[PDB]
Amino acid sequence: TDQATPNLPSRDFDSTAAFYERLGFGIVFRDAGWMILQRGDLMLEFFAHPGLDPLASWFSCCLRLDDLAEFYRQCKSVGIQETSSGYPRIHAPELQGWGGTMAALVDPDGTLLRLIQNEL
Amino acid sequence: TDQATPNLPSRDFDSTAAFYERLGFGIVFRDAGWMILQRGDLMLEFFAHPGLDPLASWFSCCLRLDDLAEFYRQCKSVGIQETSSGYPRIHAPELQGWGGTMAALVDPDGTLLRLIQNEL
């Protein structure tokens, strides 16, 4: 099956893996410069980027989810805080101008994951 | 189905849509700041980034393809040059350091799409 995957920066592969592992992602590949995490059909690939400046980062991807509320619930239960300040953090689901609901997760490297509910 | 999609920059949605249309992608959604292109199961999302410098870009994504050969054949056939610098451009499939094969496509905004043959 053809699939397009995001390529996201990681300042430290161990901390990235540990963060996403709490959300159900497992490592399916890892070498000195590349890491792939998977959670069911969700696949994220990370490149080593020790010099990243999170505040100047335009990195982001979308997670289009069949059940956004489950995932969102999961983020809050492992202790990611609902806040506007610092990272990592989450932003609650909000009705968007396009009739759908969307939340946001910001990971330890300041990467924005837009969480979007699939049109059921 | 859950899916993670890349979010890639575009200085001009018209030039982006016209380039990917030659490779079989259609527009699924477009507004002033966001655009979504689709080719079968491949989904790419673009955000407006008029200040981007295509020669200093860190943006990339992977295309993990059931038939890389076919895709690569379509790139050449629409006239994307196989060269070592400048954009857009293509890099021919290369047996990589994992046993698999890989090619590279650089798009009109300097974005690197790594083209990988899936393991059938």
Ligand SMILES: [Ca+2]
């Ligand atoms: Ca056209």
